[PDB]
Amino acid sequence: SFSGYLKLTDNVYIKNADIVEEAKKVKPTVVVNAANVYLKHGGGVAGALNKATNNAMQVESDDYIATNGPLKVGGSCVLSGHNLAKHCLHVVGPNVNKGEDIQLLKSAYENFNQHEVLLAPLLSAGIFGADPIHSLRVCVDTVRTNVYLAVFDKNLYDKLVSSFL
Ligand SMILES: NCc1cnc2ccccc2c1
């Protein structure tokens, strides 16, 4: 079970933690991946989660894309969680470094509402280029299910908690 999380709202919790280490420890029903439309898990959270599965997440993802085609920005798919979780919810937040609509961030967070509890990163944060303070605000105003946010960066975690309205 989840431990050491700071409660932000009725249903949103946050911790300064590596989401791979958090997943390996808790083994949640759902771990969220910060995916791209192609499910190419190269860097950031996706690269780290895939490397922890010994590339099994990428192999499974390539078969999914070969069958179904790419996801939509703001969309998701449920795949195996491998050694990290029962399931991985691959969610595509807009990548502002690729010029994608930041307004799609709320649609991306709506995917979390189909799962009662999730371990997740902040969508569109990190290498996706959005303001993590904005991502946390969209998260608390969109997600109604129980979300345990893992923020890798200590200095960003402190800034997020200290600025939370
Ligand atoms: N310790 C593996 C690792 C590497 N890179 C990361 C990037 C974002 C979030 C968590 C990460 C975890």
Experimental technique for the deposited model: X-ray
C-alpha distances (whole Å) from 145 to each of 11, 13, 69, 115, 140 are 6, 11, 28, 7, 10
Question: Which amino acids bring their CB within 6 angstroms of ligand 1?
Answer: 18-20, 44-45, 48, 126, 152
| CB proximity list for 127: less than 8 A, separation 6 or greater | 43, 44, 97
Cα of 17 to ligand 1 centre, how many Å?
Answer: 9
Q: Whole-angstrom Cα distance, residue 21 to residue 132?
A: 21
Pairing relation of β-strands 117-120 and 6-7?
unpaired
Q: Whose CA is nearest to atom 4 of ligand 1?
A: 48
Q: How many residues does the chain have?
A: 165
